[PDB]
């Protein structure tokens, strides 16, 4: 029932904070993955808070909320990272005090390939002059769309709802571009350009998941119970 | 020169470029390797895919090097969307060939296969529910070809001009179908979000194909280049 303007405002007010890496006056290659894992894990907690504020998300069953976050969490971490890296050519701003380049990526086997994809996405944002309002729409779309093709009377109802919210976010993107002064043709073209970036983000998440698993740590994905517990508040 | 086409000319060009539907190679008189049949079919389809790619307006204006790179990135996605398209009118089944219609139970005969079968079936069901039109389908397939490899100035600018042309064409089709402006952009977005699922399926499919430890998975640069038949 939200208007396009109300949708934008809701999403902007929902934005999580930018977190820091630990301070101690040197950085070492050996400690890099530990610092990244620590940031990712802290970002996840804020991500769950954020998701619950995306219009229509808490209308879903807790089960389906968990499934959507299971599907989307790394994509959401990535698009967040690319967004805060956009103004820093050649670098990934994991935190304001953890700004990393390609060569630092090389220290971890298999990492530079994923760094390069992320850097390429940052460059594409930059060449498109992606706006914050557009970014928060894209991030919401990822949340709602990434797990929807892999979820029953209840579920049919859930899927219809998700599609209706996704349509509203399309309307919102178009509203933003119209107010930005784009022609109808430029509006459709840019809508398309933005949504095609989501294919690349999905690609990066799958490649990244492969990479994280290859590292042989104790776990990679947030468990159902963990997501549930964070989501399943009293 | 390829960009000077109208939306109608673009649609007609893409429809005329469509590849044929191939048959599985086996004696239908003899007792019923599944992956063997599928691999044989995929490998034969790939050849027709390269010939289709050469007819997508704007594609051959790229260097041969870049044509090959795009095919390297897109080929499995393109195989998949074509499979889903011809499977649309066959709920619960994948029409790999007219003589090779498989259901998900048959897909369980190969380890790790049923998970990918289920994703493909879900996509075909989504297509059916949206009543995807052939004219929309050929636009989508062309977008996969141009978009899948674009994250690896003039060449990329050309690629984006062609992609913008296809967006224009899709909107034109929907406008002709009688959709309101709001319905047009909503449907455009719905179709493009399905492409992220097709990318997902290609990623999971590649993982699955590699896990089989067969002779090879991806077509080599030289194979694709030879199929392009350079002049
Ligand atoms: C994109 C990215 C990282 C990444 C992702 C894939 C890859 O192959 C290499 C690094 C790494 C990264 C490191 C570890 C990651 O997962 C660790 C496992 N936890 C995730 C959920 C929790 C239950 C366990 C996920 C990403 O660092 C980031 C930190 C951020 O705050 C935001 C994004 C990243
Ligand atoms: C989607 C699909 C198949 C598939 C893909 C991924 C997967 O995990 C399981 C089956 C299998 C499939 C089986 C083998 C495939 O690659 C084999 C390797 N060749 C591809 C190019 C050639 C150089 C080597 C690719 C797809 O069958 C299909 C046949 C078609 O005509 C169209 C689509 C498919």
Residue numbers in the entry:
A (entry chain A): 309 to 333, 336 to 461, 465 to 547
B (entry chain B): 306 to 337, 341 to 460, 469 to 547
The authors write:
Antagonists bind in the hormone-binding pocket and extend their side-chains outwards, preventing the agonist conformation of H12, which docks in the AF-2 cleft with its LXXML motif and blocks coactivator binding, promotes corepressor binding complexes, and affects downstream transcription. Overall, each structure depicts a canonical antagonist binding mode where H12 binds in the AF-2 cleft to block coregulator recruitment.
While all three analogs displayed similar binding motifs within the hormone binding pocket, only the 3R-methylpyrrolidine of OP-1074 is directed towards H12. This conformation prevents stable H12 docking in the AF-2 cleft and destabilizes the receptor. In agreement with the trypsin challenge assays, B-factor analysis of the x-ray crystal structures shows that OP-1074 increases the relative disorder of H12 compared to the other analogs. In comparison, the t1/2 of OP-1074 was 3.5 min; thereby exhibiting increased conformational dynamics of H12 relative to SERM compounds 4-OHT, OP-1154, and OP-1156, but decreased dynamics compared to fulvestrant. It should be noted that B-factors were only compared between the “A” monomers/chains of each structure due to significant crystal contacts in the B-chain H12. Together, these structures indicate that the PA-SERD properties of OP-1074 stem from its stereospecific 3R-methylpyrrolidine that disrupts H12 to increase the conformational mobility of the helix. In the present study, a structure activity relationship emerged indicating that the orientation of the 3R- methylpyrrolidine of OP-1074 is sufficient to confer properties of being both a pure antagonist and a SERD (PA-SERD). Moreover, when compared to the ERα LBD-endoxifen structure (a SERM), the methylpyrrolidine moiety of OP-1074 adopts a vector that places it closer to H12 than endoxifen’s methylamine to disrupt H12.
